Backbone:
């Protein structure tokens, strides 16, 4: 019944909530596949990059950059 | 042995045939994932949207629009 | 207490008013009759009312006929 | 006084309502010209194809695809 | 009973209240005064209030002055 | 004596063989049965057989059902 | 004998000259069709929008914007 | 008497109701409680409620915590 | 019943056959409008320019260039 | 505190209000720089041309075209 | 922990190593899905075609074309 | 009775004629020898004969050598 | 034994039948008369029959008149 | 002597270091103009958006998103 | 008194000088002979002289031969 | 001695001839009357005469009326 | 000393003048190479197709289309 | 008489047949120029890269990739 | 009164004339800002790069490249 | 008698007037002094005067100094 | 053996070294063809213009602009 | 014996030198201290040092703090 | 004394060390063994080591096997 | 202790070795002579050595001659 976008959001929240210190963006597709069996379908959902998809779901994921320019993704409270 | 496109066609036919009143397009990726474990790879298959892929397989899927502009997908007889 | 939570609860109240469901073109009017205002589907992030209703499948069941007419039902 | 889009919508409704079994999309420009004297200005109205314009007016036209992949257009009730 | 039909009727009621027409920037406020809410021009599919008003020429006459100020009148 | 003229005449002959029309998926086979070869719709400049048939409305009448099945008839 | 662009210019001048307080741009295609039987072929004439075509014929049409951002078109004297 | 002026005044009234500020996700509900309707941020030309609030810095002070939670305060 | 492209082809043939010395391309839209009441819908038919549409119908129209680079259009025999 | 767009709007209003007969568009960047010390950042604000930015702020600036096709910009009352 | 690209590389190597005479490119998505349960995410990984992705991993896959123009993919030694 | 079904059956008949398989460049000729015409791979929706043959793996086994030469076999 | 080799030989046979050449629009029909089928110019990789004929200059000489009519001749 | 990019980096660091709780991205151009007299020239520096420029200077600016999807910019230590 | 009006009048004067018309490549020279300068077809908004001449059909008749040579005549 | 310097001086001479200014559509003709030729605004790098005149503000003052008519004056 | 475009023009004129009945466009690159030793550099000269380059040199080459849609190129007198 | 594409094909076959162990793609333009006096005109022939042109002529050239990702080109038998 | 382009030209001439051995292009934006307080608005003026703008004003700036490929900009005499 | 032929001859006449060549910025003025008008480089199909001069190497020799100044000479 | 780019570089150096006062860019293709028999293949080498290719080989060619905006090319010492 | 294998081994040696990990900005210097050169992250195919380190998770553990500072540890 | 000259000389020295050539994957390690550092193929302007080696054909002969393995030899 | 800080210090040491400056093409070699390796301009984020040197104006003064040759000097 759920929209593809709603299902992916729910799975991503499930991935991020396991990890108290967040997930480095380069590791995120792998950590999501570990839970779900497949990749985050960011192109399908209408985004050019995984980062652009993540920006579009701010109530699921908090983005923070590091000095190197890498993103770490945290589960947004709620 | 089968082409990616042939496999997806077969899976989509299997999804749609379960549903006597068809599947609303917004629900289709979810209903296909429920059967198959993954999403319909419409970008891979060379289409910009899921609707454009579905138009390309008329002997698998019948498209009908509603007054709202939403598509419902039916298994095409055969 | 989120906007979406309040709208969802009010929608459920409207749909439950109607045992036979509500034709989608009449939904905005029936909902305003109860709530005093429209369903804020653009604010909630959707291009159409029907697109919003697809986002709440636990609340509303949607039936579409073969002539393309849409009926909305309270989901139990 | 009317917007171009409103006038075209009204003319298209007038075309489709004559035809109880709908109008095949390949025949639609001709059948509309027969009534109106000119073509449906889908590029002007901001669409890349006639099909994309028709999708944008679901309360005027119902689209149904056939096994061949051709569209038939029906007047949407009302 | 469509949203657009109800909005159209309420707009007509507001404009008829005013023999001298209503300056377009004041229309939303006058309309809320009567109806309790705003004119839902985005929901109805328009980028601006004025774009919505152009969609209902049987309801509202629009005059624009040479300094670019807009006045709206009930259409008979 | 053009390719399109010959194909058109042969198609008419096939369709006239069938008072009840010919289901579009069966047309290529019936036509080969009579002519020894397929309808050359790509050579004639069309992406599909049905697209070719639309180019010859004086020859073939096309009916499409509400389930999307297509039947072709000789045009008088 | 005349260029398409010259004919359209002449027809547009004829439309605008009827209207002493000008024609709102949203109403212009309809008012031109009322006189001429067809639409202003702005895409053919090489413009992306009707407004861009109108800008290209300043000795035919004067553009003035209103507070809302709508254009009114006036016949340019001569 | 502009829509934006009225919304701004009503927002100020809501925020002043709350000495401790209002968490941004709760703002729409609190505002409807007072006014009878939602904050019309799309009509006013903004993609989000927060984007609208940034347009009125003389009215609302916005604080964001290091966990990304947002609190809105009446501006003196 | 006819395809838009077939109707336009037929009208164009009718225009060109009147003119024993052909029609200069700059004059063609005007001469076609004189017969038909509207313009040749080359963008609708999927071409960027009128010349590109004309190239696509060689059994209707013969193109010949002049020293200036202008095209003259002749009815192709048949 | 203010958005870039709000600041530019305010500065532009300040420029235009000095000039009772408006400012010719070709002169506007210079007249704005005279007051403010820099140029109107129309590309930053998401517009391809200065004219497109000005169209987007109709409650600040009234556009009127002249017979030559040049724009004059007036402060919109208020 | 692994990058998406590293995981896909490893899975592709596992697919190709089973097949002593290589895998025809048209059959590769199907043969990879048979092992892994999903498709090779070449668009995600930043490539327009499956062939372009495969070219980018030469130490995993050897490409050889046939007279028809079809590619066969072999596991690159190591 | 579909075109693709008939072509598939005729292809199988040709391949079965040859215990040692058929070199792909010779397939069109051998097939015409039996059927009177070519394999209609463009009509069936494929850019090449080999692309068509990939669409029918239950009918034809394809072997490609390390020098890039292709041999086609009847599939049991 | 390639498709293109067989088509080339059959084309030569058709053209040699005609001392005065063959008008290009009549070529498909004359060729079918001899061979039982059409010249497979799309299969062979060409958008048009004339484009195919340009690929075989050792087989066919093409003359075009100043009115744009095309005549094809066997090449010695 | 300095590169444009180095100068802008230095000015941005100066802006952000004043603000202990960071600067909301919507407020950043204004706060930078308050110090420097002009805007951050992100298009000149080769970026489509201000956010894309900021991502490119991670040793100057730390980005953190909020639940709404707004960015707050902090001076990166050093 | 517009540039285009003056150029048009001068062109007419040049063409009337010549009962047998003027070959288009010679027109600029003949026109300069009478007027002291060239026909300003770029200023008037045209990419070519011939494109300008098409804009004034009441002034100049243009004939093009089958070898592509152009002759210009005064229009009565 | 540059082209632009000479054109600028000649323009100034034309404008000074006219105490009441010169309507922009009449400028080319008046200028030719004095100089024997047109103002070479394309050569000088401008799409229009008015665009050229904007490049020389020390030479020409431009007034535009509210009906969009343009008058050019010698600058002191 | 000559511009590339002038040299190519001169060579093309030399090719076409040999051939009293013109040169079919499909044969032109070969016939030009026979005289000159290389191909006509139409992309270098700023054209997308050979036909577009030829259209740009009307005083060198006369284009005439045939019923099939093929161009024949003739030396333009002079 | 021959098409440009046919001539280039023939020359390329002549180049490759000299070299029993094939020609590394980086060396191919030079080795072809050594025989023919000019370069392979892959852009003219409608391809974005030399590799894309070579893929389009599989009955002339066999492509094989190496571990580094370099192509070697072999004359395809016949 | 002056056009933006004329003002920038004048400022650039003023910058370059100070420097007898010219200004290295990488240093130019900084040296111009030192005089003027802002950057050269090359995107506004319709150029993709600063170098493309500079090429467009040859009577202001002389460009000379060095062995490294860096440009030095000199004031053009006058 | 073509425009380009006449311009070429007049240019040669101007350049021959000057044994020491003519600095390119002064060429338009010197040429007008002799001919009464400017060199019509845009009409002749060139973006600049210098681009036109490159099209006539048999007429004008162009020297450019290391400071980028250009001198034009009659070609013998 | 040499890369296409290396061969062209060597030929260009050979052209430029003959000419003590350099070669005007408009004359360069002709002067290179005079030595080599063909044109500089700048599109093949991946550049949109001849000037862009020349910029890419600064140790072969020195570019200097003139007041008109024309480039002169000099052999770079070495 | 691959470059990547050698770099990986040398990196492990550097990280093992440090029980408390190594701050990422100091890693290049510490690594050069041991090896005589820098970590060749561009050669190995990565835009940044950190991007390279992500490619070797069996060798280096990366911790990032909430202020965005990065610490690298030998992986057991 | 250029970087490329020094790298070229050092590469030659490494390759000459090996009568049987050096497998390309081992080249970086062998070269570092002699020189103390890697071959700087990115600095020298190449995307890969093999792309750099193609730029110096007078120094290194490259052989590629039919399984795609690469061997590098000193060029005499 | 950053890579860029160490490279900067080593560069300064090399340049100070040379009172007369160092020609840019010789810089990499002189720097390797002192440090054992190349200047890592790609790692540091620059397309060229000269682009890197522009990033450190407090360290190196760059002079370019009118023939385009570059000399680098220690900055005091
Ligand atoms: Cl979705
Ligand atoms: Cl992590
Ligand atoms: Cl995806
Ligand atoms: Cl991504
Ligand atoms: Cl990403
Ligand atoms: Cl969200
Ligand atoms: Cl990242
Ligand atoms: Cl597929
Ligand atoms: Cl459903
Ligand atoms: Cl996909
Ligand atoms: Cl989609
Ligand atoms: Cl879709
Ligand atoms: Cl299908
Ligand atoms: Cl839908
Ligand atoms: Cl809403
Ligand atoms: Cl809806
Ligand atoms: Cl409905
Ligand atoms: Cl509309
Ligand atoms: Cl129908
Ligand atoms: Cl249209
Ligand atoms: Cl369409
Ligand atoms: Cl369509
Ligand atoms: Cl609708
Ligand atoms: Cl259709
Ligand atoms: Cl709304
Ligand atoms: Cl409005
Ligand atoms: Cl108003
Ligand atoms: Cl076919
Ligand atoms: Cl079909
Ligand atoms: Cl059917
Ligand atoms: Cl036109
Ligand atoms: Cl109106
Ligand atoms: Cl149009
Ligand atoms: Cl529009
Ligand atoms: Cl518009
Ligand atoms: Cl409007
Ligand atoms: Cl809203
Ligand atoms: Cl929000
Ligand atoms: Cl929040
Ligand atoms: Cl059509
Ligand atoms: Cl005509
Ligand atoms: Cl059209
Ligand atoms: Cl056109
Ligand atoms: Cl056209
Ligand atoms: Cl034309
Ligand atoms: Cl803003
Ligand atoms: Cl002004
Ligand atoms: Cl900007
Ligand atoms: Cl602009
Ligand atoms: Cl603008
Ligand atoms: Cl303007
Ligand atoms: Cl990855
Ligand atoms: Cl296989
Ligand atoms: Cl993908
Ligand atoms: Cl693909
Ligand atoms: Cl692929
Ligand atoms: Cl393949
Ligand atoms: Cl076929
Ligand atoms: Cl094949
Ligand atoms: Cl084969
Ligand atoms: Cl075919
Ligand atoms: Cl044909
Ligand atoms: Cl013919
Ligand atoms: Cl920079
Ligand atoms: Cl803030
Ligand atoms: Cl910018
Ligand atoms: Cl932005
Ligand atoms: Cl941004
Ligand atoms: Cl933001
Ligand atoms: Cl002109
Ligand atoms: Cl002309
Ligand atoms: Cl002529
Ligand atoms: Cl001019
Ligand atoms: Cl003007
Ligand atoms: Cl005027
Ligand atoms: Cl050229
Ligand atoms: Cl020929
Ligand atoms: Cl080319
Ligand atoms: Cl082409
Ligand atoms: Cl072409
Ligand atoms: Cl020409
Ligand atoms: Cl052709
Ligand atoms: Cl070809
Ligand atoms: Cl080789
Ligand atoms: Cl090419
Ligand atoms: Cl390439
Ligand atoms: Cl390539
Ligand atoms: Cl390669
Ligand atoms: Cl400007
Ligand atoms: Cl400097
Ligand atoms: Cl800018
Ligand atoms: Cl730049
Ligand atoms: Cl630049
Ligand atoms: Cl300049
Ligand atoms: Cl530079
Ligand atoms: Cl000119
Ligand atoms: Cl010049
Ligand atoms: Cl000069
Ligand atoms: Cl190369
Ligand atoms: Cl020279
Ligand atoms: Cl090229
Ligand atoms: Cl170029
Ligand atoms: Cl160039
Ligand atoms: Cl170089
Ligand atoms: Cl140049
Ligand atoms: Cl590296
Ligand atoms: Cl890093
Ligand atoms: Cl760090
Ligand atoms: Cl390197
Ligand atoms: Cl490598
Ligand atoms: Cl290897
Ligand atoms: Cl480096
Ligand atoms: Cl360098
Ligand atoms: Cl140097």
Residues:
């Amino acid at each position: 019944g759920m929209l593809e976008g709603d299902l992916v959001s729910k799975m991503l929240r499930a991935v991020l909530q396991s990890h108290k210190n967040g997930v480095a963006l380069p590791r995120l597709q792998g950590e999501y596949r570990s839970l779900t069996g497949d990749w985050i379908p960011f192109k399908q959902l209408g985004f050019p990059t995984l980062e652009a998809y993540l920006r579009s779901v701010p109530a699921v994921v908090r983005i923070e950059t590091s000095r190197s320019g890498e993103i770490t993704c945290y589960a947004m409270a709620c």
Observations:
- Chains F and G do not touch (no CB pair under 8 Å).
